[PDB]
């Protein structure tokens, strides 16, 4: 299947971070203001006055020059949040500066309903979008509301925990802007489920 991509980081608690959102052992971990894991899955989102924010370790990273692991808010045609929360998808970009590169992403949130398939890659400095949870978390992140920063240098002012993911966008991702991709759900690599702590019970039935 094919889909469209975008980028963002609003510091909000991931939608798959609540109980009863997916058939999993436990929901996606959220973190406090200092990027420390919160073990109370009922904690209110930092984007709604609560202490639960997005964890910095839920950032993308390169395995090698051709492959990266990451996280995203997803929305798939004909499916519901229950079908994708904490599921992993193998993506191969079909446009942009890194066309041909591959990336396994775990769904940790839900994107807007557009009728098509789209993944909103979680990338520090990619843009807070509608809800700015980063301001209440640590003062905010620089960059346009949509799209975020424009140059790698801008990552230098980012809180350390968010710098790696910020720079990843310019290094491995070559600052690709909304590249398209083909995808297929695959079994989640341990590196991803261990980071979010969220594993689908049906994960063993996929590639």
Tokens 């990843």, residue located: 168
In 3D space, the residue among 134, 147, 137 whose CA is nearest the CA of residue 175 turns out to be: 147
How far CA 102 is from CA of 61, 92, 140, 147, 206, in Å, comes to 12, 4, 31, 22, 18
Please calculate the CA angle 110-70-119 and round it to the nearest 5 degrees.
35
Answer yes or no: 10 catalytic.
yes
Task: Provide CB contacts within 8 A for 24, sequence distance 6+.
Answer: 16, 85, 86, 198, 199, 200, 201
Q: Is 165 helix (H, G, I), strand (E, B) or coil?
A: helix
How far CA 189 is from CA of 31, 175, 186, 194, in Å, comes to 22, 25, 9, 9
Question: What are the φ/ψ torsions at residue 152 (nearest 5 degrees)?
Answer: -55, -35
Q: Which residues are catalytic?
A: 10
């Amino acid at each position: 299947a094919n889909g469209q991509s975008t980028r963002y980081w609003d510091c909000c608690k991931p939608s798959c971070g609540w109980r009863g959102k997916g058939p999993v052992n436990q929901p996606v971990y959220s973190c406090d203001a200092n990027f420390q894991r919160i073990h109370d899955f009922d904690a209110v989102s930092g984007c709604e006055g609560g202490p639960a924010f997005s964890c910095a370790d839920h950032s993308p990273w390169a395995i090698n020059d051709n492959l990266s692991y990451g996280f995203a808010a997803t929305a798939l045609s004909g499916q519901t949040e229950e079908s994708w929360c904490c599921a992993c998808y193998a993506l191969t970009f079909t446009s942009g500066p890194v066309a041909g590169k591959t990336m396994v992403v775990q769904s940790t949130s839900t994107g807007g309903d557009l009728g098509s398939n789209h993944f909103d890659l979680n990338i520090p400095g990619g843009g807070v979008g509608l809800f700015d949870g980063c301001t209440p978390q640590f003062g905010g992140l620089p960059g346009a509301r949509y799209g975020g920063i424009s140059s790698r240098q801008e990552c230098d002012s980012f809180p350390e925990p968010l710098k790696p993911g910020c720079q990843w966008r310019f290094d491995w991702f070559q600052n690709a802007d909304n590249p398209s991709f083909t995808f297929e759900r695959v079994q989640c690599p341990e590196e991803l489920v261990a980071r979010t702590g969220c594993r689908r019970h049906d994960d063993g039935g996929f590639a």
